[PDB]
Structure formats: C-alpha cells, structure tokens
Amino acid sequence: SWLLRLFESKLFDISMAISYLYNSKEPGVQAYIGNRLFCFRNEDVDFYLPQLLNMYIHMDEDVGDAIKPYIVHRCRQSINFSLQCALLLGAYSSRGTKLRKLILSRLAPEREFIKSLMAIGKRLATLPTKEQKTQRLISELSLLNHKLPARVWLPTAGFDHHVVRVPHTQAVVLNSKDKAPYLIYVEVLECENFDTTSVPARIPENPSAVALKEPWQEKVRRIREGSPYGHLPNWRLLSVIVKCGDDLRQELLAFQVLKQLQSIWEQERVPLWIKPYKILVISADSGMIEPVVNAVSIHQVKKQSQLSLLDYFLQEHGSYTTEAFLSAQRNFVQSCAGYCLVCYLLQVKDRHNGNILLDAEGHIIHIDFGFILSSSSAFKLTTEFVDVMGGLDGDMFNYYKMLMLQGLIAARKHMDKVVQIVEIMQQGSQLPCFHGSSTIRNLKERFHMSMTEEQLQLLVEQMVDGSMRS
Amino acid sequence: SWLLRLFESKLFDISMAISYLYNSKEPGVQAYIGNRLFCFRNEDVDFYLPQLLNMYIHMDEDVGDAIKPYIVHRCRQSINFSLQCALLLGAYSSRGTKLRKLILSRLAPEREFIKSLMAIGKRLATLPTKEQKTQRLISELSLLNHKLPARVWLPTAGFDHHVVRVPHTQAVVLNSKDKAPYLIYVEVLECENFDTTSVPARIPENPSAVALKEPWQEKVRRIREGSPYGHLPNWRLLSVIVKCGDDLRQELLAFQVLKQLQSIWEQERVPLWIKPYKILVISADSGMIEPVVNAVSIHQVKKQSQLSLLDYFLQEHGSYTTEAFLSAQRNFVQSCAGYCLVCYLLQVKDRHNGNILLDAEGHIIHIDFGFILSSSSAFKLTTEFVDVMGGLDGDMFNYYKMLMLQGLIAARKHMDKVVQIVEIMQQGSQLPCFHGSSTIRNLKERFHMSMTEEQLQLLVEQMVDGSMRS
Amino acid sequence: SWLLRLFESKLFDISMAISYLYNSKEPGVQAYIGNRLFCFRNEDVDFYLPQLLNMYIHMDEDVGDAIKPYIVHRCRQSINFSLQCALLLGAYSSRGTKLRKLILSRLAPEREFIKSLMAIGKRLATLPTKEQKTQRLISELSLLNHKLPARVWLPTAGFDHHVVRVPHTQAVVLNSKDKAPYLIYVEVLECENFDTTSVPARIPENPSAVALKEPWQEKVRRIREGSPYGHLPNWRLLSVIVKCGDDLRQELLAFQVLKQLQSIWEQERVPLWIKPYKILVISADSGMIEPVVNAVSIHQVKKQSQLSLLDYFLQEHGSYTTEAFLSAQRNFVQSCAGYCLVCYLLQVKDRHNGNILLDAEGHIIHIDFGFILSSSSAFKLTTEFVDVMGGLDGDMFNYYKMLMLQGLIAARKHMDKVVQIVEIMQQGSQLPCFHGSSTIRNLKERFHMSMTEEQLQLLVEQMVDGSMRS
Amino acid sequence: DEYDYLFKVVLIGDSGVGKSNLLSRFTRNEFNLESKSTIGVEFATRSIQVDGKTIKAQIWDTAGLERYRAITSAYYRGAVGALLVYDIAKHLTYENVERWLKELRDHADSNIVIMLVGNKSDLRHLRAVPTDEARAFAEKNGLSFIETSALDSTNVEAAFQTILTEIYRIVSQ
Amino acid sequence: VSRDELMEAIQKQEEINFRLQDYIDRIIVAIM
Amino acid sequence: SRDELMEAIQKQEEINFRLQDYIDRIIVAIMETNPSILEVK
Amino acid sequence: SRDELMEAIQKQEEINFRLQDYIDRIIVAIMETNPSILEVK
Amino acid sequence: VSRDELMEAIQKQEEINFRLQDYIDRIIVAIM
Numbered sequence A, B, C: 001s002w003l004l005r006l007f008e009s010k011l012f013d014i015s016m017a018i019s020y021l022y023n024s025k026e027p028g029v030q031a032y033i034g035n036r037l038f039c040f041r042n043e044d045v046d047f048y049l050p051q052l053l054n055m056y057i058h059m060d061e062d063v064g065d066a067i068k069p070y071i072v073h074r075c076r077q078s079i080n081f082s083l084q085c086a087l088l089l090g091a092y093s094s095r096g097t098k099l100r101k102l103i104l105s106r107l108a109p110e111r112e113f114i115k116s117l118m119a120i121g122k123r124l125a126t127l128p129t130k131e132q133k134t135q136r137l138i139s140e141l142s143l144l145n146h147k148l149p150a151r152v153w154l155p156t157a158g159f160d161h162h163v164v165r166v167p168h169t170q171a172v173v174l175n176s177k178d179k180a181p182y183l184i185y186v187e188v189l190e191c192e193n194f195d196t197t198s199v200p201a202r203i204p205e206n207p208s209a210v211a212l213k214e215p216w217q218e219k220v221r222r223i224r225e226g227s228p229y230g231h232l233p234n235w236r237l238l239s240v241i242v243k244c245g246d247d248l249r250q251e252l253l254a255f256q257v258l259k260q261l262q263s264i265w266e267q268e269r270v271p272l273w274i275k276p277y278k279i280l281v282i283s284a285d286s287g288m289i290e291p292v293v294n295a296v297s298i299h300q301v302k303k304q305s306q307l308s309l310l311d312y313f314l315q316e317h318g319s320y321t322t323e324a325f326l327s328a329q330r331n332f333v334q335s336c337a338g339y340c341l342v343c344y345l346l347q348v349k350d351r352h353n354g355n356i357l358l359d360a361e362g363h364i365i366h367i368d369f370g371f372i373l374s375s376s377s378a379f380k381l382t383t384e385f386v387d388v389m390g391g392l393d394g395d396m397f398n399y400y401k402m403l404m405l406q407g408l409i410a411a412r413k414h415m416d417k418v419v420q421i422v423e424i425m426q427q428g429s430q431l432p433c434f435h436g437s438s439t440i441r442n443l444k445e446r447f448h449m450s451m452t453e454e455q456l457q458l459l460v461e462q463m464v465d466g467s468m469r470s
Numbered sequence D: 001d002e003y004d005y006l007f008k009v010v011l012i013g014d015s016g017v018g019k020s021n022l023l024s025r026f027t028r029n030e031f032n033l034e035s036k037s038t039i040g041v042e043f044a045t046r047s048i049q050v051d052g053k054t055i056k057a058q059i060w061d062t063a064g065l066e067r068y069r070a071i072t073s074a075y076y077r078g079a080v081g082a083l084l085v086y087d088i089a090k091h092l093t094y095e096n097v098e099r100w101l102k103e104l105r106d107h108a109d110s111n112i113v114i115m116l117v118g119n120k121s122d123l124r125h126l127r128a129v130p131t132d133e134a135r136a137f138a139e140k141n142g143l144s145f146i147e148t149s150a151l152d153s154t155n156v157e158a159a160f161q162t163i164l165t166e167i168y169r170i171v172s173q
Numbered sequence E, H: 001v002s003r004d005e006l007m008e009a010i011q012k013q014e015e016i017n018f019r020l021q022d023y024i025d026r027i028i029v030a031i032m
Numbered sequence F, G: 001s002r003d004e005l006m007e008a009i010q011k012q013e014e015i016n017f018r019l020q021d022y023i024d025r026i027i028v029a030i031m032e033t034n035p036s037i038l039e040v041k
C-alpha cells in the first residue's frame, strides 16, 4: 500500500499522475489514474492536453482507454474543449480518427469560420508583394463581417466570448513569401459562460479605417471609437497571426517548455523574464499564434530608426540617468538571461535579429522555433547587446551572469517537469526536432545534474564567452 | 522471375501454395497465392481448410486478408462449406469472432438440429448405467423425427443429401461414463445439389424396431424395410457417433495425417492398409465421428467369443487352407504394418485392445488418439498377434517387416507433406499434443532422413523387437 | 538412452557425428562425440578436416576443445596431416593462431620448398608475356633440383612418397596475367610409409629437354627416359598447377561437393560422370590444383583445330559408326548431365569454353569455380553440344535427360550430406559465395524436396530448354 | 546516339503498389514477387519514338515510404510527367491518391501531366476497386487512366507510351 | 507474443539491415 | 544480462538510423550536382 | 554474431519454460496430496 | 513493434521468472 499511499497524498499532482501513467506498465495503475483525472482542476489538466492525446494515439490501447472517459466528460461540458481535442487529434496523426469523428458528432460555424480564414491565406500565394497581398486580405476579410456575430470564438483568448466584428482595414500581411502569414485584429464580447448564453445581436455599422504605426492602446482607441459595439463595457479586442501553410507543433511544444520554465522561475524566486506566446494547432499544415503587441523585430528597429540599439533605447526611453531607461535596461537584462537559458537548453538555432522582438518596456522576445533540439546559428551576445547592458565591467552585466546561474540552479531542481513534456511528445512524432535517437539523453546532459554550483558558474562563463566569439 | 516460373508451372499444387503462404514473409507472394487459390479444385483445397483457417486466426493480418476472399467465395456457393467454416472458426479460438458472425449472417434448422443432439447427450450424464442411458436416448431421439424432413444434413456424408428420418430404436449409447458418446443411424435422400433443391415431403409412417448384433447390410435391410422412405432408390443410410463433451481437434489432426499417409502409400505402391475415419469438430468441447461398421473392439471380441484371436479368425473365416482366411490374414498383416508406422511416427500412446477394432475382412483399426506426440503405453506386438500372422518364421511375418520398410521408405520421400499438416496446426494451439517445445523437431528426427535403406532395415528390426518385449 | 542407442549403433558414421557435433548445444554430446572420433577410420575423417577445423576456429570453445585431442593425436602420427592442419588453420583466419604455432612446434624443408615455389610465381609478374615468363620459370625451377631429394612431398599425391627431381624444361606458365598460375611436373619415389623411411640418395644426372604437345603417357616416357631415377619401379610422375596469388577456398569447397555427389551417384546406381580435382589451400592468398591430364579447353580445341566440335570428335575418334566414337559420345553425354546438375545445384556462373575442358576419352570437365551460389553466365547447352549428342531426336539425347532426372532423384535422397558440407563452411566465412543471407535456404529449395517424379521431369525439361535459349 | 527530347518522369504512390516492378518491367522486361524497399530514389531510362521523334525518358522511382518524403519532393522539381499508382486489390491505396495529388500542388510544377494507374490487374478475384469508379474519379480530376499488371506485363508499355505521347504534345508552343 | 513471432521479428530486422548495407555498398562502388 | 542485450540492440539501431541519414545526405548532394552517376545499367 | 546471440537467447528461454513446467508438475502433486503446506502465514 | 516495446516485453518475462523462482523457493523451504 506504499504506492497507493503516495497517490492519496497531497503530493499527487497532474504531473505525477501523467508520469506514472506514462511509465507504469501496470494496467491497474493506468486505470486508477484514469479515474483520478476527474479529481483535478480543469485548468491544470488543460495544459497537458497534447500529452494525454499523444499518448492516447500512439500508446497501448490500455493507456488510451484509461484516458478517454475523462476526455469525453470534458468534451461534453465545453465545446471549446471539444474543438481543441478534435484539432489536436487530427494534427497528431498523419486510432485517432474514430474518436475525432465521435467528438465532431453543431460546431459548423466555427469550423467554417476557420476554414474560410485558412482559405483566404492560401489565395494570397499568387500575389508576389506584401502590399498587393494586404489589399486582397483587407477586401476579403470585410466579407466575413457579413457572417457575424455567430456561435464562433478565438481559442487563443484568455476568456469566454463571442466574436462580433473584424476591423479588416487594420489587418496586415507580414512578408512576401509563398505561404505568408497574416495578422488580424478581432472584436469580441466577453461572457461568463459561452455554452449557455447569447450569440448577441448584429449592429449594422457605419478615419477609424486608416492604418499607421502606433501603440496598442492608441490602436484600441481608434478601432473601438469607429466600432458599432465599441461603446459596451462587455467589449474587448484580440489579435492573432494566421499561418495557413506552416506546421505549428514544434511551436506548441516550445510554448509548453517556456510556460513551465516561467512557472519554475516564479516558484523559485528568480526574476528572469520570458514570454510564452499562445499557439493553436489547426492541422499538421496550419495554425495560429497570439502575437506580442507593442513589439517589433530588432532588425527592422535598426532599419526604420537607422540607429544603434543603445541610441534607440536612449531616444525611446531617455538618458541612462532616467527611471524609464534604468527600468528598460533591467528588463533587457532579465529577458536576455531568460532567453539565453532557453536557447541553450532547447538548442535553439537560426538565431538572428529577424527572430528577436523588442517590446515597449525593453524586454526582448525570441520567436522562430523551427530548428530546435536534434534538428539539422546558436544564441549570440553581440557587443551591441553588451553595450545596452553597460559593458563587460557593468554591474548589470555581472548581474546578467548572476541571473543565468540562479535560473540554471532553479531549473535543475525541477528538471523532471521539463523533460516529461518533451519526452512524451516524442512518442509517435515524425518532427525534425526528434530526428535523433538521443534527443532526450542530450537534453538531460544539458542540465548537468552532477555539478556543484562552482562548476555551474564555470559553465555559465564558458557559455557567455562562447556567445561572444560568434 | 524464377520463383514466378515455379508458381506458373504444373508443379504448383495446393500443398506448395500453402507452404509458401506459411513461410514467405513477402506480402506480394501471400497476395499472389491468395489469388491463385481460386484456380484450384474445391476438393483438394477442402482437405486443408483447418490449416487455412488456423493461419487466418493466429497469423499476420496480411496472411488472413489474402485467404479471406477465397473463403468468402466458397462460403457463398455452399452452405455446407459455410457451416464447417463457422464451426472451425469457433472451435479454434478459446480475430475469429468477427468473420464467424459474418458467415452466420438461414442455417437455423441445422444449428438447432445440432444443438438438440448436443443437448440430448448432456442430459444422459445423470443416468449411471448404459441401459438406462440408451432408453432415454431412444425416447428422446424419436421427438426429433417430428421436425423432419428439413433443411438439415450430416457434414460427415460422402455426398449431398437431405435427412428424412431417425430410426431411434436402433440408436445405442457406448459406455457408462459421465459424458458418454452415443451412436445413431440416420436416413437420407441423395441430391445432385443441395443448395438448389427440394427439402422433400414428409411421409407420416407406421419388428424393424428390435435391435440386436448383426452385420451392417442386414441392419440396412431391417431399417429400410420398416421405413416409410425405404422403397426409394434415392434413399441411403448413414451413421455418426456424437461426442457431446469431448474435444475432437487432436482427432481431426490425426485424420489428416492418416489420410495423407494413405495417399502417400497409394501413390508409391505399397499395399499397406489403414482407415482414416471422418471427424466433425463442432466446438472445442464437442464433435462427431463416422464409425467403421462391421467392426468391434479386440477386447470385446475376446469377451463375447471367449476364444483366442486366431481361434476367432478360424471360426469366422475358415481353416487357414481356405481363401477367406488367407485373404483375412493378408488384411491383418497389411493393416498391422500400416498402423505400427502410424503409431511410431505419431508416437501414439495408451495402446490397448479397447482402442483397436477388428473389421469383417480382418483389418485392424486403431482409434483413441488422445495421447499423441509430445503429450504426457506404445504400440505392442503380442504373441497372440504374431500367431495370427503364422509365427516368427512365417512368410507373411517376414512380409510384415518388408511392408514396414517399404512404407517407411515411401514416407521419407514425402516427409514435407506430413510435417506441413502438423506444423501449421501447432500455431496458436494449446492442445496437449503440442505441450513440448520440440514437437516438430522430434517428428522430423523420426523420419531419419540421413539413413540408407540398410540402416532403416535395422531400425525396423529394433522397432519390431521393441514391440514384443512389452 | 534412445539417443545413446543411436550413437552406439552401426548407423553412426562420421557424417552423423559431425551433424550432431554441429547442432547439439549439449556439452556432454559434444564431448562424447569428440571421444568417438578416435573410433573412426582416418580416411573417412580426413575428408571433413576443413569442417572440423572451421568449427574449431569459429565456434564455442566447448566445441573446439572436444575436437582438439583427436586432431593432436592425428598430427603426432602423420606430418602430412600436421601440414594440412597448419595450412588450413592459417588460411581460415584473416583462436586459430595459438594451435598452428603448437603444431608447427622439423617441417622446414617442406615449408621452404613451398615458400620458394610461391616466391617464384610472384616474380613472374614483371614479365608481360607468356613466353618470357615460361623462360624465367624454367631457369628458376632448375635451381630447386639442387636441393633434392629431401624430406619434401606433394600433399596432392594419392600416395606416400619422396620428391626427387623437377623436369624444369617441361614446366609451362598458363596465361599473360599479373599473378599467373604455372604448371609443373614432379618426379617422386613411392613409399609404404613416409614418416619412417629413407629420404633417398641423390643421383647427380646428365632431347628429353624439348617440350611439345603430346599425350600424358608419351610425356611420361620422354621425361622418365631422360631421368636419372627413371629406371626404378619405385618411380612415378605427378603434376600440379601453382597459384601464387589466387584464393582456393571456394575451389576447395566445390571439390568436396563434387566428391560427395560422385559418391552419391556411385552408391545409387546412376552412371553420371564428373571429375573432382584435388585442391591444396596454402594461404587465403595461395594454393595448388591437381590438373586433369590429356585434356584441353574447348575454346583452344577450336582454335588449334579450326574445326567444329563434332568434326574434332570425328577426326580424333573416328566415324560415328566406330566403337571409339560411340564410347566417347557416351562419356560426353554422361559428363554433360553430371556437370549440368552440378552447375544448377551450385549455381555455377561465368560459364564459357575457357572454363570447360575436354579429355582424351570424350568427358568434359568444368573448372573455374569463382562465382558460385550467392556470388554476384549460367550453364549453357549450345547446338554445337547438341550436335555431338546426335541431335534433339537422338536416343543419346533422350538418355541425357533420363540421366539428369535419375541423378536428381538420387541427390534428393542424400540432400543432408551435401548441405552439411556447405552449411558448416559458411560459419565464419567472408567468402563472396556466402554474401547472401539465404544461401543455404536457396540451396535447399533447389532440391525441390516436395516434388513427385513427374514434377521433376518437368523441371528437367524447363532446365534443358532454359539451357538452350542463351 | 541522339535524342530530340529528354523527359523527366516520376513514379509515385503508396508503398507496395508495384512502382519498382512497373519500372523493371518497362525498362528491362523483368519482374519479381520478392521485393526490395525503394530507398529514397532509384533511376532508370529508356528511349521511344512518337510522331517521328526519338524521346529518351528518364524515370525516377521515388519510394512510397514516408521516411523519405522530405528528399523525394526535391525530385518533383521540373518533372514533366507523374505516374500515380495504386494497387487494384488494396482499397486503402486508392483512398490515399487524394493526398498524393496535393503532394504535387505543393512541391511540383502545377502544369504537370498525370496518369492514374491501377496496378495488379492480374489479381482479378481480389479486386477492391472497380474499374468504373476509378475512371470516373480519373477525369473528374483531369487525369488519364489505365490498369496494368507488371506481373503478366499487360499495358505496361502502353501506359508509358500514352503518358510520354501526351507530354510530347503539351510542350509545343 | 509467441517465439515464432519474436523470431520472425528478428529475422525481418536482419534482412532489412543486410539489404540496406548492400544498397549502400552498391552506391559506394559507383562513387568509387 | 538483459540490460546489456537491450543496450546492444538500441545501439545497433541508433547506428543504422545514423548511417541511413549520413547516406541520404551524401545522396542528395550527388542528386543536386551529378545525377548521371546514379544510372541503373 | 547475431544468429549466435539469437540462438543463445532461444536456449535460455527454452530452459526457463522447461523449468517452469518441471515446477508446475511438482506443485500439482502437492496440491493433490497435502495442500496445507502451501498456507500463507 | 519498437525496440523499446521489445525490451519491455523481455523485462516483463524476466520479472515473472524471478518472481516464480522466489515463489518456488518459498514452497521448497517449507517442505525442507
């Protein structure tokens, strides 16, 4: 009864549940945990839905059958939940098929809303320039307002809601590529519960149309004021990037890892900073991303400003003796240390200033997580970055190294939670990041679990000095 | 194209087909042979139905799926065929289930006819004596005539037919055991084709009832003359033992082996004699046997006669200077040599005079094939048998040894055909005869494929001398 | 005690011994047989020395250690035996080494005699033409007479002997190739036992020197008459081809197979004809071959005669109504059927008239057994061959097919003995003929053990008709 | 000697349908039941005449296995023709032809000649795709259609000869 | 699973390895 | 010992999968430079 | 060599299966004579 | 099946063998 003692203790959290579900080959354990899933908070389990569903698909029938009833139970009480299940099941098989059809057995408004959004993006392939694309996008988006409001929502939203309106004039396409992604803004009315309310009534509509580079809150103002629905307290504005021809499953995996490391760093008390950005997988081909607002690429910050990074900091925040600057510097240093650790641990490659965003407060944010782990340049610390930190002898730079060590010390103590996420996703995966046989082995080595702190200090120094050589 | 050359040659027979089906792991081969089954004569394939169906059940899906369409094709053109499939599928699984139900998707008359026969046998368990049992059997059988004639038949029959009448007064139970088998006689009207004809009309009926020990043809006379239908040229009489609580799968396997050795001995030109008796498996628990008529156990021949075996020969055929005797002696010698070989090759155990029948012409017939191969006394040549042969210096006895050698020489040349039968049946078998790990290896060694004839002569001598020691 | 019964019976022959030695994993069996080797005739065991030694090298220590003492025992009573052991052990490893050195722990005269012969052959590489080579060979061979007679012999000889003299003027080199083989004739004095006799005395020596195309017995006359030692009754003449840079292990394997098939065909009573030619492996690089005398290649028979094969037969034997011709035709037919079978069973490739010899009596002999079995054209029956047979409607041609069938029927009955030879040699072999994974499986299929005679007749027809298409 | 044209053609389909044997049949008139998985890509060539012009065909046997589908798509580049093959006796293989055509409207010229091929016509009794249903689907999607047996050699030459001919008069102007 | 199925799994894996090695050696010889 | 047997088997397939990838990377380079090399004669 | 490794493994499980049967045959005899022996205390 | 599944099948068979040997030794000690 020593094992059952554990499972009945407070120790028992969704993580432990999933670990034993994954590792125990005892069918009685599997079934016991399958039953205890019901006992957890929805929010906590939600985070691991991809794992559960991956296991269902690629593992023993025993394992699948233990998980199913809980999933069915969730699916019955939330169509949002049903949707994500259906989307994920489909995406993670190219066993799955029979259940997807059973969940989809209603959701047509949403599925057709998404199909249309997908369809739009695919058409833009014939227009070779950004500007031409944006024009067709803007025109074609306007047609979708003709079907709103309806029983439709954005799964990437923090809350329950109904979508009412698309400010098409504000939408923009991001590059000149063959299957270019495009960004849109969407208007919604908040709910307390979606499943039991409304579908609110259409308001037929009638400057707010003009689009230019401005902060997020100034853009909310402009769109709100022009909007039929903008007066309501119920009203909120969302944003998504739509990727019609790009796989997002790596991107989803990265999200979970970032989110876990974030919680790890909050729980221990290391003030590193990172930004997980929400992912919605729609097919093996397609999905969406919630972008960070008030942020633009380092590369284009230097092409529109024509300045050095520091000079831009100084222009946009003030002299280094001002609060605004010292706070931004700190956010820079804390976001850099964070993302260094992530890049090292995940072996993030293809790192350049097109893939690094800078936000309004001075945090950086890395973004293109193609090329990670086993997949076949690395994280770099250019002297332009070191300059913003105040230089090699700077206090804040010493502190950057201090943070790196601290955050590594923290990670090591919660290693299992991180590895779990990746190890379960690898299961029936054909993804480039798992091309190796030793993906997980290499990942564990990178935690250096044998080391003393003094040893880690040295590793941090090596890492930093490595980041500067080029 | 050298393999395909073979398969398109005349060489290609059902055996070779099955061999390659069993051994090749190439799906293209499996499929090619699956297609070529259609090309063979029904009769030839029929003989191997248990193998095919065993493979279907216990082998790769690939293998099953190659066989199925042919089986379906046969099942559609003969309900007899369908029946045996359904019966065997059920018996060889305790995959199979889904197809059985699809074949059974009509046959109710036959299935209920058999269920009732089975049910009868199970009731006799409460009656502790032969005579009491026979009385209940006779009464209970009479009730079945109330359902005849119908769409019902005896699969053990050489021909197509309809069952019309059961001469219940003639039926008898065989022993005092808990799940005793019982013998019945059945009246039928021959068909040219069952599937497309009749169900003939009832004839309500009206000495023929009395039962005593008499030859088969004298018993046909008596029953025929008493029967409503007996006048017809269309009319024939059959017989089956019904085993309600005994497994017959070993018995079925033995049958095939006997039948193969018989053909081998006909094809080479060795005049050994044996009698395969037909088997119908109905469940893992139950089945039927076609008995040899004008034959009774050696043991009871000695208890009702009170004579020595030879003395019985002399009484029943004549003095050893008569034809009838010399012919019977020859049948004795030829049937003994045959059955010795079978007992040795199959390692037949539990050999006593309760398990050996003697027929009207002087052939012996061994019968209880529980305890064969790996299953955990052997074939014996008592001096009473040697006496009937005319003694150790007899010509006919020398000839007995001559036959044994000749029949062994023959067997060796066709070894593959024999081994094939057993080896395929072993597949997902839980039967006592396959308890070992080296059943097939031991079987092959017993052919002594390395030996020269002179070596086999010596082995025969050892064998014989072994059979006399006790 | 049933197994031990077998081993103590007359059945027990070297073959069976080796089979069980190879197959049983029971150490008590291995040891029992290791002991019983001593019990066999030397001659019978000799034939399998390569197998034993291969097993010793590549198998379980258990197996090696069971064999060793017998080998040691033989090695002590015959230096010839020791030699072959030492040579084979070395050749079959590129475990072995420790024992080779222990056997070589005397034999220097022979080893140096062979080293010199080898050394000679290697020097000829620098002379680009046959004639130049032959001239250097003849000169360099003369020097070796300066070291004769000695404790030296030709292991390829049918008997015990001492080598006395080399008629160097008669030696010839066979081709213009880089590592050309060369043929020599050698003079010897027969012994009753080598190990305990002589080394006879030198006779210093003094037309017999001239070399031309003549029969073997006319060449023995010429050399004998010129020889110091030629007067003696003790005197005999041998011949060997010396291959300094060619591997002979395939060639040795082929020899055994041929020799076995020959005995098989003698034992059954099929008058097929073939000629195994003796092989001596000296290293993995080098060895010797006993050539067939009074025989020359088909190809050169047609280039020196300028005739058709038949026309040559008619010139050299007489009209087809003469005895000499009818006898030669028969030898042709019997040697063809033989070699066809061998080519098919061994999958002999690279078949052309440079690889087929014709002897003085009309037998053909195939020779270059590179490219056999799994190794990556086949045996051909040209109409020129069919003509010599008297044509498609000829009696002798029908009889050729009759022989093929008969010899195949015979082979099938002794299959194990053939397969054993090959299967054991494959063990730690890196030879091109074992490149496949299914060498032995393919070999077994080629015996067609399932077939009836009528089936084999058809296979023979297919084979023949295949041999004619080209 | 000299050809007037060199046509690059690819063979695609589910693994096991008979691509390598269609090719071995067509180029050296050989077939085999025992089969050796096509790893990545295999190359074979043969010349024919259509309308008086010697055309050399270059055939690329791509492999149906997914393991290799990242590097096969590299070869879709500028191929003038694609033989899309399915097994007549295995229905699933007909079902996947839809994903196999999308595979061309992502990694290959959007103006390529396609023939649908039902292989293994010799397996009459195991047929899982009726000739009529397939030919219906064929021209509903603007594809040419034929049934072959690499094994007995039915239609193999014809199949190639059709698609090469079809190609030879798309190219002009 | 049965020993027959285990043996069959191992034989199939070996056949593939040996095939693949030969496929590779045939590519390498061409490059040579 | 089974742990050692399992480790031997895992190691053998890791090597095989690596070697197949090593090979495909070589083959793609030939395919993009001199595909004539790859002709089946 | 992998064939020799496979043969070693097949031999080890043959022995184990034999030994289990040897044991079950002993156990059945106890079960039919003196099952008290088999008490869980 | 994957090598991980094969390894897991073999580990499971050994665990049973080792258990069964101990079950037996516990019976034998009682008889002793």
Ligand SMILES: Nc1nc2c(ncn2[C@@H]2O[C@H](COP(=O)(O)OP(=O)(O)OP(O)(O)=S)[C@@H](O)[C@H]2O)c(=O)[nH]1
Residues within 6 Å of the ligand: B026, B027, B028, B029, B032, D014, D015, D016, D017, D018, D019, D020, D021, D022, D032, D033, D034, D035, D036, D037, D038, D063, D064, D065, D119, D120, D121, D122, D123, D148, D149, D150, D151, D152
């Ligand atoms: N009956 C029949 N069998 C065929 C035919 N074509 C191929 N096969 C068989 O199908 C099997 C697989 O064929 P194969 O040549 O591997 O096709 P493939 O598409 O190249 O398979 P892969 O290379 O992607 S592994 C082989 O056993 C082959 O003999 C046909 O027309 N008729």
Ligand SMILES: CC(=O)/N=c1/[nH]c(C)c(-c2ccc(Cl)c(S(=O)(=O)NCCO)c2)s1
Residues within 6 Å of the ligand: A174, A181, A241, A243, A277, A289, A290, A291, A292, A293, A294, A295, A296, A297, A354, A355, A357, A367, A368, A369
């Ligand atoms: C202004 C702005 O860039 N907002 C964004 N916020 C986020 C999370 C953005 C983002 C994040 C990840 C990715 Cl993968 C993309 S992307 O549109 O698909 N860029 C591809 C190569 O850049 C965009 S973009």
Ligand SMILES: CC(=O)/N=c1/[nH]c(C)c(-c2ccc(Cl)c(S(=O)(=O)NCCO)c2)s1
Residues within 6 Å of the ligand: B174, B181, B241, B243, B277, B289, B290, B291, B292, B293, B294, B295, B296, B297, B354, B355, B357, B367, B368, B369
């Ligand atoms: C008169 C007579 O005995 N006819 C028979 N013919 C045959 C084949 C008989 C037979 C054959 C096999 C078996 Cl297994 C049986 S049996 O009824 O089941 N006997 C069990 C132990 O004898 C009976 S009995």
Ligand SMILES: CC(=O)/N=c1/[nH]c(C)c(-c2ccc(Cl)c(S(=O)(=O)NCCO)c2)s1
Residues within 6 Å of the ligand: C174, C181, C241, C243, C277, C289, C290, C291, C292, C293, C294, C295, C296, C297, C354, C355, C357, C367, C368, C369
């Ligand atoms: C006159 C004559 O040719 N006598 C010979 N007898 C024999 C057995 C010869 C022979 C047999 C086999 C081989 Cl392998 C050779 S050989 O010298 O090595 N020829 C190589 C290609 O022919 C020669 S040659």
